[PDB]
């Protein structure tokens, strides 16, 4: 019963008086991938009961951000609770990683350059080898692709699409809010040639995402027409997905909240 909306109503992205919201806890954990101690926020659902098990959404920030950045607007914490209260989302655990996970010897200062991007690309290893096992060991989670969502903004949305299609066996639900250039070959004004992580014909999955969703503002000054280009390539490749544009929005929380609002309505069987 999917009804995509091109904006998030204020009442779903705002904390409502008299409603309890979950809180983030910052976790420090060791990564064999970066060979360093790293941080992530874990947001347990209201009333978290260790004798229950919960599905998990991993939500990835953009370039030059960090694990608290998706908490700077209340949509992240408010939307899943506000949908839950209307029976339109499932109870879930939300994880906000630090997505910049360079191998030792390759950490560089944030900037629009290929060497800095490599640390985001390496997040596929951080997520699968370190963060997912940590969550299974330390929290009462549901495992399996039907219980696992991955979404992100801008560079984190590029990274979500890359991981969600290359390892669709692990990730049931993929959400990409204004994804950055360079999943596939391309060229832009911020850093010139992007060689592409994969070719366009390779941007596909053997086992299909249960849900793949992509959005973007119509006037995004940072990633421009790249999200639309991904829609077009996925369509050419017969990859089922949802695409929509947020009218007049830029690289901003209107585009993000619209994406997350539609995405969380689909995750974990919420539509039955
Ligand atoms: C990978 O190349 C790019 C990444 C971005 C990401 C911006 C963001 O995450 O806010 C913007 C322009 C680029 O050329």
**Choice from 64, 112, 114, 159 to test ligand 1 binding pocket (greatest atom count within 8 A of CB):** 112
d(CA 87, CA 254): 23
Interacting residues of 17 by C-beta distance below 8 A, sequence separation 6+:
none
Tokens of residue 84, six digits:
């839950």
Cα–Cα distance, 214 to 102 (Å, whole number): 26
Beta pairing, strands 24-31 & 36-43 = antiparallel
Determine whether the shortest distance from the Cβ of 117 to ligand 1 is under 6 A: yes
Tell me if residue 141 falls in helix, strand or coil: strand
Does the C-beta of 154 come closer than 6 Å to ligand 1? yes
**What is the enclosing helix (H) or strand (E) of 13?**
helix 10-13
Q: How many residues does the chain have?
A: 272
Contact criterion met (CB below 8 Å) for 141 and 56:
yes
Pairing assessment for the beta strands 56-60 and 211-217 based on DSSP bridges: unpaired
Element (H, E) at 79: helix 75-85
Write the CB contacts of 32 (distance below 8 Å, at least 6 apart in sequence). Answer: 129, 130
Span from the CA of 178 to the centroid of ligand 1 (angstroms):
10
What is the 58 CA–ligand 1 centroid distance (Å)? 20
What is the spatial distance between Cα 181 and Cα 165, in angstroms, rounded to a whole number? Answer: 16
Best substitution site from 116, 161, 180, 256 to test ligand 1's pocket, by max atoms within 8 Å of Cβ?
180
- On whether the CB atoms of residues 45 and 91 are closer than 8 A, the answer is yes
How is residue 120 written in tokens? 């985001």
Both ends of the chain: CA-CA distance in Å?
9
Cβ of 190 closer than 6 Å to ligand 1, yes or no, is yes
- Kindly state if the Cβ of 12 falls inside 6 Å of ligand 1: no
Domains of the chain: 1-272 (3.40.50.1820)
Determine whether the shortest distance from the Cβ of 196 to ligand 1 is under 6 A: no
d(CA 110, CA 113): 8
Residue 214 and residue 228 in contact, taking contact as beta carbons nearer than 8 Å: no
Distance CA 234, CA 237 (A): 5
The CA-CA-CA angle for residues 201, 207, 208, to 5°, reads: 75
Q: At what angle do helices 114-121 and 155-166 cross, to 10 degrees?
A: 50
| 181: DSSP letter | S
- Rg of the chain (C-alpha set): 17
Q: Using an 8 Å Cβ cutoff, are 60 and 151 in contact?
A: yes
Ligand 1 contact, 66 CB (< 6 A)? no
Alpha carbon nearest to ligand 1 atom 12, residue: 190
Token pair for 42 = 């874990």
**CA–CA distance from 149 to each of 46, 57, 199, 200 (Å)?**
19, 4, 24, 23
Method: X-ray
Q: Which two tokens stand for residue 103?
A: 């191998």
* Pairwise CA distance, residues 50 & 250, whole Å: 41
Q: How far apart are CA 210 and CA 238, in angstroms?
A: 14
- Across the chain, where does the E strand assignment appear? 24-31, 36-43, 56-60, 93-97, 148-153, 173-177, 186-188, 192-194, 211-217, 242-246
Residues paired with 112 in a beta bridge: none
Q: Which of 190, 217, 255 to mutate to test the pocket of ligand 1 (most atoms within 8 A of CB)?
A: 190
What's the CA gap between 5 and 188, in Å, rounded? 29
Picking from 160, 179, 5, the residue whose alpha carbon sits closest to that of residue 79 is: 5
Spatial separation of the C-alpha atoms in residues 255 and 178, rounded to whole Å: 7
């Amino acid at each position: 019963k999917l009804q995509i909306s091109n904006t998030c109503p204020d009442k779903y992205r705002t904390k409502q008086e008299g409603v309890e919201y979950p809180t983030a806890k910052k976790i420090t954990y060791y990564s064999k991938v970066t060979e360093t101690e790293r941080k992530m926020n874990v947001i347990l659902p209201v009333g978290y009961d260790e004798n229950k098990k919960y599905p998990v959404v991993y939500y990835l920030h953009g370039l030059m951000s960090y694990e608290d950045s998706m908490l700077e607007d209340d949509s992240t914490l408010a939307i899943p609770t506000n949908l839950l209260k209307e029976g339109r989302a499932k109870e879930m655990i939300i994880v906000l990683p630090d997505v910049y996970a360079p191998k030792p010897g390759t950490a560089v200062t944030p900037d629009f350059n290929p060497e800095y991007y490599k640390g985001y690309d390496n997040f596929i290893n951080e997520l699968i080898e370190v963060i997912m096992p940590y969550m299974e060991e330390h929290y009462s989670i549901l495992t399996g692709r039907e219980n696992t969502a991955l979404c992100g903004f801008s560079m984190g949305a590029r990274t979500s699409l890359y991981i969600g299609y290359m390892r669709s066996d692990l990730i049931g639900y993929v959400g990409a809010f204004a994804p950055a250039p360079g999943i596939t070959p391309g060229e832009d004004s911020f850093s010139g040639k992007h060689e592409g992580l994969i070719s366009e014909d390779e941007f596909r999955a053997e086992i299909q995402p249960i849900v793949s969703l992509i959005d973007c503002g119509t006037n995004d000054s940072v990633v421009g027409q790249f999200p639309k280009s991904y829609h077009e390539i996925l369509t050419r490749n017969n990859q089922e997905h949802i695409w929509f544009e947020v009218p007049g929005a830029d690289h901003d929380w209107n585009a993000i909240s619209a994406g997350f609002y539609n995405f969380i309505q689909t995750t974990f069987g919420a539509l039955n």
